[PDB]
CSV table of C-alpha atoms in Angstrom, one decimal:
chain,number,residue,atom,x,y,z
F,59,UNK,CA,52.4,22.0,-9.4
F,60,UNK,CA,52.6,22.0,-5.6
F,61,UNK,CA,51.3,20.2,-2.5
F,62,UNK,CA,51.6,22.6,0.4
F,63,UNK,CA,48.9,24.8,2.0
F,64,UNK,CA,49.7,27.7,4.3
F,65,UNK,CA,47.4,28.8,7.0
F,66,UNK,CA,45.9,32.3,6.9
F,67,UNK,CA,46.3,32.5,3.1
F,68,UNK,CA,43.5,32.1,0.6
F,69,UNK,CA,46.0,32.0,-2.3
F,70,UNK,CA,46.7,28.3,-2.1
F,71,UNK,CA,43.2,27.0,-2.2
F,72,UNK,CA,42.1,29.8,-4.6
F,73,UNK,CA,44.8,28.4,-7.0
F,74,UNK,CA,43.8,24.8,-6.3
F,75,UNK,CA,40.2,25.3,-7.5
F,76,UNK,CA,41.5,27.0,-10.7
F,77,UNK,CA,43.4,23.8,-11.5
F,78,UNK,CA,40.6,21.2,-10.7
F,79,UNK,CA,38.7,22.6,-13.8
F,80,UNK,CA,41.4,21.5,-16.2
F,81,UNK,CA,41.4,17.7,-16.3
F,82,UNK,CA,45.2,17.8,-16.7
F,83,UNK,CA,46.1,19.2,-13.3
F,84,UNK,CA,42.9,17.6,-11.8
F,85,UNK,CA,44.1,14.1,-12.3
F,86,UNK,CA,47.5,15.0,-10.9
F,87,UNK,CA,45.6,16.4,-7.9
F,88,UNK,CA,43.7,13.2,-7.3
F,89,UNK,CA,46.6,11.0,-8.2
F,90,UNK,CA,48.1,12.4,-5.0
F,91,UNK,CA,46.9,11.6,-1.5
F,92,UNK,CA,49.1,14.4,-0.3
F,93,UNK,CA,47.2,17.7,-0.6
F,94,UNK,CA,43.8,16.0,-0.9
F,95,UNK,CA,43.8,15.5,2.9
F,96,UNK,CA,45.1,19.1,3.2
F,97,UNK,CA,42.2,20.3,1.1
F,98,UNK,CA,39.8,18.5,3.5
F,99,UNK,CA,41.6,19.9,6.6
F,100,UNK,CA,41.2,23.5,5.3
F,101,UNK,CA,37.5,23.1,4.5
F,102,UNK,CA,36.9,21.5,7.9
F,103,UNK,CA,38.3,24.3,10.0
F,104,UNK,CA,38.6,27.5,8.0
F,105,UNK,CA,36.4,30.3,9.1
F,106,UNK,CA,36.9,32.2,5.9
F,107,UNK,CA,33.8,31.7,3.8
F,108,UNK,CA,35.5,32.3,0.5
F,109,UNK,CA,38.0,29.6,1.3
F,110,UNK,CA,35.4,27.0,2.2
F,111,UNK,CA,33.5,27.2,-1.1
F,112,UNK,CA,36.8,27.2,-3.0
F,113,UNK,CA,37.7,24.1,-1.1
F,114,UNK,CA,34.3,22.3,-1.4
F,115,UNK,CA,34.1,23.2,-5.1
F,116,UNK,CA,37.5,21.6,-5.6
F,117,UNK,CA,36.3,18.4,-3.9
F,118,UNK,CA,33.2,18.5,-6.1
F,119,UNK,CA,35.2,18.5,-9.3
F,120,UNK,CA,37.2,15.5,-8.0
F,121,UNK,CA,34.0,13.5,-7.4
F,122,UNK,CA,33.5,13.3,-11.2
F,123,UNK,CA,36.1,10.6,-11.6
F,124,UNK,CA,36.4,7.1,-10.1
F,125,UNK,CA,39.7,7.8,-8.4
F,126,UNK,CA,38.7,11.3,-7.3
F,127,UNK,CA,36.0,9.7,-5.3
F,128,UNK,CA,38.4,7.2,-3.9
F,129,UNK,CA,40.8,10.1,-3.1
F,130,UNK,CA,38.1,11.9,-1.1
F,131,UNK,CA,36.9,8.6,0.4
F,132,UNK,CA,40.2,7.3,1.8
F,133,UNK,CA,41.2,10.8,2.8
F,134,UNK,CA,38.3,11.0,5.3
F,135,UNK,CA,36.3,13.5,3.3
F,136,UNK,CA,32.9,12.1,4.1
F,137,UNK,CA,32.9,13.1,7.8
F,138,UNK,CA,34.2,16.5,6.6
F,139,UNK,CA,31.5,16.9,3.9
F,140,UNK,CA,28.9,15.9,6.5
F,141,UNK,CA,30.2,18.5,8.9
F,142,UNK,CA,30.0,21.0,6.0
F,143,UNK,CA,26.2,20.4,5.7
F,144,UNK,CA,25.9,22.8,8.6
F,145,UNK,CA,27.6,25.6,6.7
F,146,UNK,CA,25.6,28.9,6.4
F,147,UNK,CA,27.0,29.6,2.9
F,148,UNK,CA,24.5,28.3,0.4
F,149,UNK,CA,27.4,27.8,-2.1
F,150,UNK,CA,29.2,25.6,0.4
F,151,UNK,CA,26.0,23.6,1.2
F,152,UNK,CA,25.5,22.9,-2.5
F,153,UNK,CA,29.0,21.5,-3.1
F,154,UNK,CA,28.9,19.4,0.1
F,155,UNK,CA,25.6,17.8,-0.7
F,156,UNK,CA,26.5,17.3,-4.4
F,157,UNK,CA,29.9,15.7,-3.6
F,158,UNK,CA,28.2,13.5,-1.1
F,159,UNK,CA,25.5,12.7,-3.7
F,160,UNK,CA,28.2,11.6,-6.2
F,161,UNK,CA,30.0,9.4,-3.6
F,162,UNK,CA,26.6,7.8,-2.7
F,163,UNK,CA,26.0,7.1,-6.4
F,164,UNK,CA,29.3,5.5,-7.3
F,165,UNK,CA,31.8,5.2,-4.5
F,166,UNK,CA,31.6,1.7,-2.8
F,167,UNK,CA,31.2,1.9,0.9
F,168,UNK,CA,30.1,5.5,0.8
F,169,UNK,CA,26.6,4.7,2.1
F,170,UNK,CA,27.9,3.2,5.3
F,171,UNK,CA,30.4,5.9,5.8
F,172,UNK,CA,27.7,8.6,5.5
F,173,UNK,CA,25.5,6.9,8.0
F,174,UNK,CA,28.3,6.5,10.5
F,175,UNK,CA,29.2,10.2,10.1
F,176,UNK,CA,25.6,11.1,11.0
F,177,UNK,CA,24.8,12.2,7.5
F,178,UNK,CA,21.1,11.1,7.8
F,179,UNK,CA,20.3,13.4,10.7
F,180,UNK,CA,21.9,16.4,8.9
F,181,UNK,CA,20.2,15.7,5.6
F,182,UNK,CA,16.8,15.4,7.2
F,183,UNK,CA,17.4,18.7,9.0
F,184,UNK,CA,18.1,20.4,5.7
F,185,UNK,CA,14.6,19.5,4.4
F,186,UNK,CA,13.4,22.8,5.6
F,187,UNK,CA,15.4,24.7,3.0
F,188,UNK,CA,13.7,26.4,0.1
F,189,UNK,CA,15.8,25.8,-3.0
F,190,UNK,CA,14.2,23.1,-5.1
F,191,UNK,CA,17.4,22.0,-6.8
F,192,UNK,CA,19.1,21.7,-3.5
F,193,UNK,CA,16.1,19.8,-2.0
F,194,UNK,CA,16.1,17.5,-5.0
F,195,UNK,CA,19.7,16.4,-4.4
F,196,UNK,CA,19.2,16.1,-0.6
F,197,UNK,CA,16.1,13.9,-1.0
F,198,UNK,CA,17.9,11.7,-3.5
F,199,UNK,CA,20.7,11.1,-1.0
F,200,UNK,CA,18.0,10.1,1.5
F,201,UNK,CA,16.4,7.7,-1.0
F,202,UNK,CA,19.7,6.0,-1.7
F,203,UNK,CA,20.6,5.7,2.0
F,204,UNK,CA,17.1,4.5,3.0
F,205,UNK,CA,16.5,1.8,0.4
F,206,UNK,CA,16.9,-1.7,1.8
F,207,UNK,CA,18.2,-0.3,5.0
F,208,UNK,CA,15.8,-0.5,8.0
F,209,UNK,CA,18.3,1.1,10.3
F,210,UNK,CA,18.4,4.3,8.1
F,211,UNK,CA,14.6,4.3,7.9
F,212,UNK,CA,14.3,4.4,11.7
F,213,UNK,CA,16.9,7.2,11.9
F,214,UNK,CA,15.0,9.2,9.3
F,215,UNK,CA,11.8,8.7,11.3
F,216,UNK,CA,13.5,9.8,14.6
F,217,UNK,CA,14.8,12.9,12.8
F,218,UNK,CA,11.3,14.0,11.8
F,219,UNK,CA,11.7,12.8,8.2
F,220,UNK,CA,8.0,12.0,7.4
F,221,UNK,CA,6.6,15.4,8.3
F,222,UNK,CA,9.4,17.2,6.4
F,223,UNK,CA,8.9,15.1,3.3
F,224,UNK,CA,5.1,15.5,3.4
F,225,UNK,CA,5.5,19.3,3.7
F,226,UNK,CA,7.6,19.2,0.5
F,227,UNK,CA,4.8,17.4,-1.4
F,228,UNK,CA,2.3,20.0,-0.2
F,229,UNK,CA,4.4,22.9,-1.1
F,230,UNK,CA,6.4,22.5,-4.3
F,231,UNK,CA,5.6,21.9,-8.0
F,232,UNK,CA,9.1,21.2,-9.2
F,233,UNK,CA,8.7,17.7,-10.8
F,234,UNK,CA,12.2,16.3,-10.1
F,235,UNK,CA,11.8,17.2,-6.4
F,236,UNK,CA,8.2,15.9,-6.2
F,237,UNK,CA,9.3,12.6,-7.8
F,238,UNK,CA,12.4,12.1,-5.7
F,239,UNK,CA,10.6,13.0,-2.5
F,240,UNK,CA,7.8,10.6,-3.4
F,241,UNK,CA,10.5,7.9,-3.9
F,242,UNK,CA,11.7,8.5,-0.3
F,243,UNK,CA,8.2,8.3,1.0
F,244,UNK,CA,7.6,5.0,-0.9
F,245,UNK,CA,10.7,3.5,0.7
F,246,UNK,CA,9.6,4.6,4.1
F,247,UNK,CA,6.0,3.6,3.5
F,248,UNK,CA,6.8,-0.1,3.9
F,249,UNK,CA,8.3,0.5,7.4
F,250,UNK,CA,5.9,-0.4,10.2
F,251,UNK,CA,7.1,2.6,12.2
F,252,UNK,CA,7.4,5.2,9.4
F,253,UNK,CA,4.0,4.4,7.9
F,254,UNK,CA,1.8,5.6,10.8
F,255,UNK,CA,4.0,8.7,11.1
F,256,UNK,CA,3.6,9.5,7.4
F,257,UNK,CA,-0.2,9.0,7.7
F,258,UNK,CA,-0.3,11.3,10.8
F,259,UNK,CA,1.6,14.0,8.9
F,260,UNK,CA,-1.2,14.0,6.3
F,261,UNK,CA,0.8,12.0,3.8
F,262,UNK,CA,-2.1,10.4,2.0
F,263,UNK,CA,-3.9,13.7,1.3
F,264,UNK,CA,-0.6,15.3,0.2
F,265,UNK,CA,0.2,12.4,-2.2
F,266,UNK,CA,-3.3,12.7,-3.6
F,267,UNK,CA,-2.6,16.2,-4.7
F,268,UNK,CA,-0.3,14.9,-7.5
F,269,UNK,CA,-2.4,12.0,-8.9
F,270,UNK,CA,-3.3,14.1,-12.0
F,271,UNK,CA,0.2,15.4,-12.6
F,272,UNK,CA,1.4,15.1,-16.2
F,273,UNK,CA,4.4,13.1,-15.0
F,274,UNK,CA,3.6,9.4,-15.0
F,275,UNK,CA,6.6,8.5,-12.8
F,276,UNK,CA,5.3,11.0,-10.2
F,277,UNK,CA,1.8,9.7,-10.4
F,278,UNK,CA,2.9,6.0,-10.2
F,279,UNK,CA,5.2,6.6,-7.2
F,280,UNK,CA,2.4,8.4,-5.4
F,281,UNK,CA,0.1,5.5,-6.2
F,282,UNK,CA,2.6,2.9,-5.0
F,283,UNK,CA,3.1,4.8,-1.7
F,284,UNK,CA,-0.6,5.4,-1.2
F,285,UNK,CA,-1.3,1.7,-1.5
F,286,UNK,CA,1.2,1.0,1.3
F,287,UNK,CA,0.0,3.8,3.5
F,288,UNK,CA,-3.8,3.2,3.1
F,289,UNK,CA,-3.5,-0.4,4.5
F,290,UNK,CA,-5.3,-0.2,7.9
F,291,UNK,CA,-4.6,3.5,8.5
F,292,UNK,CA,-6.4,5.7,11.0
F,293,UNK,CA,-9.5,7.5,9.8
F,294,UNK,CA,-8.6,10.8,8.0
F,295,UNK,CA,-10.3,14.0,7.0
F,296,UNK,CA,-10.0,15.8,3.7
F,297,UNK,CA,-9.9,12.5,1.8
F,298,UNK,CA,-12.8,13.6,-0.5
F,299,UNK,CA,-10.6,14.8,-3.4
F,300,UNK,CA,-8.3,11.8,-3.2
F,301,UNK,CA,-11.2,9.3,-3.3
F,302,UNK,CA,-12.7,11.1,-6.2
F,303,UNK,CA,-9.5,11.0,-8.2
F,304,UNK,CA,-9.0,7.3,-7.4
F,305,UNK,CA,-12.4,6.4,-8.9
F,306,UNK,CA,-11.4,8.4,-12.0
F,307,UNK,CA,-8.1,6.5,-12.3
F,308,UNK,CA,-9.9,3.2,-12.5
F,309,UNK,CA,-10.6,4.0,-16.1
F,310,UNK,CA,-7.0,4.5,-17.0
F,311,UNK,CA,-5.3,2.6,-19.8
F,312,UNK,CA,-2.3,2.0,-17.6
F,313,UNK,CA,-2.7,-1.3,-15.8
F,314,UNK,CA,-0.5,-0.4,-12.9
F,315,UNK,CA,-2.5,2.8,-12.4
F,316,UNK,CA,-5.7,0.7,-12.4
F,317,UNK,CA,-4.2,-1.9,-10.1
F,318,UNK,CA,-3.1,0.6,-7.5
F,319,UNK,CA,-6.3,2.6,-7.7
F,320,UNK,CA,-8.4,-0.5,-7.0
F,321,UNK,CA,-6.0,-1.5,-4.2
F,322,UNK,CA,-6.1,1.9,-2.5
F,323,UNK,CA,-9.9,2.1,-2.8
F,324,UNK,CA,-10.2,-1.3,-1.2
F,325,UNK,CA,-7.9,-0.3,1.7
F,326,UNK,CA,-9.6,3.0,2.3
F,327,UNK,CA,-13.2,1.6,2.2
F,328,UNK,CA,-12.6,-1.3,4.6
F,329,UNK,CA,-14.6,-0.6,7.8
F,330,UNK,CA,-14.8,3.1,6.9
F,331,UNK,CA,-18.4,4.1,6.3
F,332,UNK,CA,-17.6,7.7,5.5
F,333,UNK,CA,-15.3,6.7,2.7
F,334,UNK,CA,-17.8,4.1,1.5
F,335,UNK,CA,-20.4,6.9,1.1
F,336,UNK,CA,-18.0,9.2,-0.8
F,337,UNK,CA,-16.8,6.5,-3.2
F,338,UNK,CA,-20.4,5.5,-4.0
F,339,UNK,CA,-21.5,9.1,-4.4
F,340,UNK,CA,-18.9,9.7,-7.2
F,341,UNK,CA,-20.0,6.5,-9.1
F,342,UNK,CA,-17.6,4.1,-7.5
F,343,UNK,CA,-19.8,1.0,-8.0
F,344,UNK,CA,-20.1,1.5,-11.7
F,345,UNK,CA,-16.3,2.3,-12.1
F,346,UNK,CA,-15.4,-0.8,-10.1
F,347,UNK,CA,-17.8,-3.1,-12.0
F,348,UNK,CA,-16.4,-1.8,-15.4
F,349,UNK,CA,-12.9,-2.5,-13.9
F,350,UNK,CA,-13.7,-6.1,-13.0
F,351,UNK,CA,-15.2,-6.7,-16.4
F,352,UNK,CA,-12.2,-5.2,-18.3
F,353,UNK,CA,-9.8,-7.1,-16.0
F,354,UNK,CA,-10.8,-10.5,-17.1
F,355,UNK,CA,-8.8,-13.2,-15.4
F,356,UNK,CA,-6.2,-10.7,-14.1
F,357,UNK,CA,-6.5,-11.3,-10.4
F,358,UNK,CA,-4.1,-8.5,-9.4
F,359,UNK,CA,-7.0,-6.2,-10.5
F,360,UNK,CA,-10.1,-8.2,-9.8
F,361,UNK,CA,-9.2,-9.1,-6.2
F,362,UNK,CA,-8.8,-5.6,-4.8
F,363,UNK,CA,-11.7,-4.4,-7.0
F,364,UNK,CA,-14.0,-7.1,-5.7
F,365,UNK,CA,-12.8,-6.4,-2.2
F,366,UNK,CA,-13.7,-2.8,-2.7
F,367,UNK,CA,-17.2,-3.7,-4.0
F,368,UNK,CA,-17.7,-5.9,-0.9
F,369,UNK,CA,-16.9,-3.0,1.3
F,370,UNK,CA,-19.2,-0.7,-0.6
F,371,UNK,CA,-22.1,-3.1,-0.5
F,372,UNK,CA,-22.2,-3.3,3.3
F,373,UNK,CA,-22.8,-1.2,6.4
F,374,UNK,CA,-23.3,2.4,5.3
F,375,UNK,CA,-26.3,4.7,4.5
F,376,UNK,CA,-26.2,3.9,0.8
F,377,UNK,CA,-25.4,0.2,1.0
F,378,UNK,CA,-28.7,-0.9,-0.5
F,379,UNK,CA,-28.3,1.4,-3.4
F,380,UNK,CA,-24.8,0.0,-4.0
F,381,UNK,CA,-26.2,-3.5,-3.9
F,382,UNK,CA,-28.7,-2.6,-6.6
F,383,UNK,CA,-26.1,-0.6,-8.6
F,384,UNK,CA,-24.0,-3.7,-9.1
F,385,UNK,CA,-26.9,-5.4,-10.8
F,386,UNK,CA,-28.0,-2.3,-12.7
F,387,UNK,CA,-24.5,-2.0,-14.1
F,388,UNK,CA,-24.4,-5.6,-15.4
F,389,UNK,CA,-22.1,-6.9,-12.6
F,390,UNK,CA,-23.9,-10.0,-11.4
F,391,UNK,CA,-22.9,-12.4,-14.2
F,392,UNK,CA,-19.1,-11.6,-13.8
F,393,UNK,CA,-19.3,-11.9,-10.0
F,394,UNK,CA,-20.6,-15.5,-10.3
F,395,UNK,CA,-18.1,-16.3,-12.9
F,396,UNK,CA,-15.2,-15.4,-10.6
F,397,UNK,CA,-16.2,-18.3,-8.3
F,398,UNK,CA,-15.0,-20.6,-11.0
F,399,UNK,CA,-11.4,-21.6,-12.2
F,400,UNK,CA,-8.9,-20.2,-12.9
F,401,UNK,CA,-9.7,-18.0,-9.9
F,402,UNK,CA,-7.4,-18.5,-7.0
F,403,UNK,CA,-8.4,-18.6,-3.3
F,404,UNK,CA,-8.0,-14.9,-2.3
F,405,UNK,CA,-10.3,-13.8,-5.2
F,406,UNK,CA,-12.8,-16.6,-4.5
F,407,UNK,CA,-13.0,-15.7,-0.8
F,408,UNK,CA,-13.5,-12.0,-1.7
F,409,UNK,CA,-16.1,-12.9,-4.3
F,410,UNK,CA,-18.1,-15.0,-1.9
F,411,UNK,CA,-18.1,-12.1,0.5
F,412,UNK,CA,-19.4,-9.8,-2.2
F,413,UNK,CA,-22.2,-12.2,-3.1
F,414,UNK,CA,-23.2,-12.4,0.5
F,415,UNK,CA,-23.7,-8.6,0.5
F,416,UNK,CA,-25.4,-8.6,-2.8
F,417,UNK,CA,-27.9,-11.2,-1.5
F,418,UNK,CA,-29.1,-8.7,1.1
F,419,UNK,CA,-30.9,-7.0,-1.7
F,420,UNK,CA,-34.1,-8.9,-2.6
F,421,UNK,CA,-33.9,-7.8,-6.2
F,422,UNK,CA,-30.6,-9.7,-6.5
F,423,UNK,CA,-32.1,-13.0,-5.2
F,424,UNK,CA,-33.5,-14.2,-8.6
F,425,UNK,CA,-30.6,-13.0,-10.8
F,426,UNK,CA,-28.0,-14.6,-8.5
F,427,UNK,CA,-30.0,-17.8,-8.7
F,428,UNK,CA,-30.4,-17.5,-12.5
F,429,UNK,CA,-26.7,-16.9,-12.9
F,430,UNK,CA,-25.9,-20.1,-11.0
F,431,UNK,CA,-24.5,-18.8,-7.8
F,432,UNK,CA,-26.1,-21.5,-5.6
F,433,UNK,CA,-24.6,-24.7,-7.1
F,434,UNK,CA,-21.1,-23.2,-7.3
F,435,UNK,CA,-21.3,-21.9,-3.7
F,436,UNK,CA,-22.4,-25.4,-2.6
F,437,UNK,CA,-19.6,-27.2,-4.5
F,438,UNK,CA,-17.1,-24.7,-2.9
F,439,UNK,CA,-18.6,-25.4,0.5
F,440,UNK,CA,-18.7,-29.2,0.2
F,441,UNK,CA,-15.1,-29.4,-1.0
F,442,UNK,CA,-13.8,-26.8,1.5
F,443,UNK,CA,-15.5,-28.7,4.3
F,444,UNK,CA,-13.9,-32.0,3.3
F,445,UNK,CA,-10.4,-30.4,3.1
F,446,UNK,CA,-10.7,-29.1,6.7
F,447,UNK,CA,-11.5,-32.6,7.9
F,448,UNK,CA,-8.5,-34.1,6.1
F,449,UNK,CA,-0.3,-20.4,3.9
F,450,UNK,CA,-2.8,-17.9,2.6
F,451,UNK,CA,-6.5,-18.7,2.8
F,452,UNK,CA,-7.8,-21.3,5.3
F,453,UNK,CA,-10.5,-23.6,4.0
F,454,UNK,CA,-12.4,-22.8,7.2
F,455,UNK,CA,-12.8,-19.3,5.9
F,456,UNK,CA,-14.3,-20.7,2.6
F,457,UNK,CA,-16.7,-22.9,4.7
F,458,UNK,CA,-17.9,-19.9,6.8
F,459,UNK,CA,-18.1,-17.6,3.7
F,460,UNK,CA,-20.1,-19.9,1.5
F,461,UNK,CA,-22.5,-21.0,4.3
F,462,UNK,CA,-22.9,-17.3,5.1
F,463,UNK,CA,-23.8,-16.4,1.5
F,464,UNK,CA,-26.3,-19.3,1.4
F,465,UNK,CA,-27.8,-18.1,4.7
F,466,UNK,CA,-28.7,-14.8,3.1
F,467,UNK,CA,-29.8,-16.3,-0.3
F,468,UNK,CA,-32.1,-18.6,1.7
F,469,UNK,CA,-34.3,-15.6,2.4
F,470,UNK,CA,-35.9,-16.3,-0.9
F,471,UNK,CA,-38.4,-19.3,-1.3
F,472,UNK,CA,-37.1,-20.4,-4.7
F,473,UNK,CA,-33.5,-20.3,-3.5
F,474,UNK,CA,-34.5,-22.5,-0.5
F,475,UNK,CA,-35.8,-25.1,-3.0
F,476,UNK,CA,-32.6,-25.1,-4.9
F,477,UNK,CA,-30.4,-25.2,-1.8
F,478,UNK,CA,-32.2,-28.2,-0.3
F,479,UNK,CA,-32.4,-29.9,-3.7
F,480,UNK,CA,-28.6,-30.0,-3.6
F,481,UNK,CA,-28.5,-32.3,-0.6
F,482,UNK,CA,-27.1,-29.5,1.7
F,483,UNK,CA,-29.1,-30.2,4.9
F,484,UNK,CA,-26.9,-33.1,6.1
F,485,UNK,CA,-23.8,-30.9,5.6
F,486,UNK,CA,-25.3,-27.9,7.4
F,487,UNK,CA,-26.3,-30.1,10.4
F,488,UNK,CA,-22.7,-31.4,10.5
F,489,UNK,CA,-21.4,-27.9,10.6
F,490,UNK,CA,-23.2,-27.4,13.9
F,491,UNK,CA,-20.4,-29.5,15.4
F,492,UNK,CA,-17.7,-27.1,14.1
F,493,UNK,CA,-15.2,-25.8,16.7
F,494,UNK,CA,-15.5,-22.4,15.1
F,495,UNK,CA,-18.4,-20.3,16.5
F,496,UNK,CA,-18.7,-18.2,13.3
F,497,UNK,CA,-19.3,-21.4,11.3
F,498,UNK,CA,-21.8,-22.6,13.9
F,499,UNK,CA,-23.7,-19.3,13.5
F,500,UNK,CA,-24.1,-19.3,9.8
F,501,UNK,CA,-24.9,-23.0,9.8
F,502,UNK,CA,-27.7,-22.5,12.4
F,503,UNK,CA,-28.7,-19.4,10.4
F,504,UNK,CA,-29.2,-21.2,7.0
F,505,UNK,CA,-31.0,-24.0,8.8
F,506,UNK,CA,-33.2,-21.4,10.4
F,507,UNK,CA,-34.2,-20.0,7.1
F,508,UNK,CA,-34.7,-23.5,5.6
F,509,UNK,CA,-36.8,-24.6,8.6
F,510,UNK,CA,-39.6,-22.1,7.8
F,511,UNK,CA,-40.8,-24.5,5.2
F,512,UNK,CA,-42.6,-27.5,6.8
F,513,UNK,CA,-41.1,-30.2,4.6
F,514,UNK,CA,-37.6,-28.8,5.2
F,515,UNK,CA,-38.1,-28.6,8.9
F,516,UNK,CA,-38.9,-32.4,9.0
F,517,UNK,CA,-35.8,-33.1,6.9
F,518,UNK,CA,-33.6,-31.1,9.4
F,519,UNK,CA,-35.1,-33.1,12.2
F,520,UNK,CA,-34.7,-36.4,10.4
F,521,UNK,CA,-31.0,-35.4,10.1
F,522,UNK,CA,-30.8,-35.5,13.9
F,523,UNK,CA,-30.2,-31.8,14.3
F,524,UNK,CA,-32.1,-31.7,17.6
F,525,UNK,CA,-29.1,-32.8,19.7
F,526,UNK,CA,-26.5,-30.4,18.5
F,527,UNK,CA,-28.9,-27.5,18.4
F,528,UNK,CA,-29.8,-28.2,22.0
F,529,UNK,CA,-26.1,-28.0,22.9
F,530,UNK,CA,-25.8,-24.7,21.0
F,531,UNK,CA,-28.6,-23.2,23.2
F,532,UNK,CA,-25.9,-22.7,25.8
F,533,UNK,CA,-23.3,-21.2,23.4
F,534,UNK,CA,-21.4,-18.2,24.8
F,535,UNK,CA,-22.0,-16.8,21.3
F,536,UNK,CA,-25.5,-15.2,21.5
F,537,UNK,CA,-26.0,-15.3,17.8
F,538,UNK,CA,-25.4,-19.0,17.7
F,539,UNK,CA,-27.8,-19.6,20.6
F,540,UNK,CA,-30.5,-17.4,19.0
F,541,UNK,CA,-30.5,-19.2,15.7
F,542,UNK,CA,-30.3,-22.6,17.4
F,543,UNK,CA,-33.4,-21.7,19.4
F,544,UNK,CA,-35.2,-20.5,16.3
F,545,UNK,CA,-34.6,-23.8,14.5
F,546,UNK,CA,-35.7,-25.9,17.5
F,547,UNK,CA,-39.0,-23.9,17.6
F,548,UNK,CA,-39.9,-24.5,13.9
F,549,UNK,CA,-39.1,-28.2,14.4
């Protein structure tokens, strides 16, 4: 029942630890700001290893109670504990990081105090350790400190956080550590600075390793992180296994797994012909079509899935096969259906883009017509055009998209009859006056397809298309000028 510590003696601290076990003396110890600071002082300066751990272990026991935390807190224990994270005694390290962990969990203001003490840099530097239980605690501290705190995220990045965390995911199998580390990566994955770094470290491939782990919380966190990372990332190697697993996960009974899988696949296939090839080769088209069908009106699933299908049906060696595969796997009816309510604009925009690609395949021309793609595309176009003449999706995008789809569909003679029968020529001619070059292009394009039929060519001329087409001959956009010349010729 004392309060005085004498230098050069291990007896004092050695006795103090023995008391912190018994809750009786322990409360007395933390009900007293006296020796608590003296405990800290001893730990912070003592070069006797055996004293340090006896000291740190004492503080650890105190961190189990609300006032014991406050005691350590108001006694300036946090900077001391942070300093102790440089200790070469594994026993001391464990107590330091654990006590800090407890403070971070419960003690108000501890998070800020640790950051100020330079705790982040020290913790990141400890990520090269090899004890999984120690790493699990350290990574948990990092997660707590990084969540909702951009300042901490940037510090973790500057300290080499991303590479160290990815190395952990590539190395260990301890679930608790893999889960907690993935949680840190998820928090960092929404940072515009951390994200490219995680990707460069090989983070996507590493996270892909655990997508078939029995732990659902691990799989889901890896999926959430992957969705963030895959958005407009640099081209990567070794993505084969990951892409394969993602396709498999599309058939999961877990909706969040399915939603993430579709989203990642969409992100990874956008303007990436290599990935498009791989996804198609492992049956990606069929899996995505089944996913869309099962999803119904759930646009959180259909939107990324349709986006992925749009990517897969364009600009790669097996694009044509993918275009046929959508039809062969009973996908055409549901695609047309998604153009109708209750579909919102992002889905509609994506669906229009998909139809445009599907129309590149001649064997899709008739089924798309039979399923009623043309009148709905025209109604969407007419209304979208009116809106532009009166934040999400701009109606200008819908105008360009629908006209673009009609341009491709107009390759078929029967489609041209349907398209013109819907009083579209006056609208297409008006779109020639659009300020947007891309709208001018598809407008002149569909008119060019239509004008190959004599009767339609006369109707285009009667609509007074000659004057704007002549102006478009001098368009800085070569595509616009080429189509404009082609229409003028056939007239």
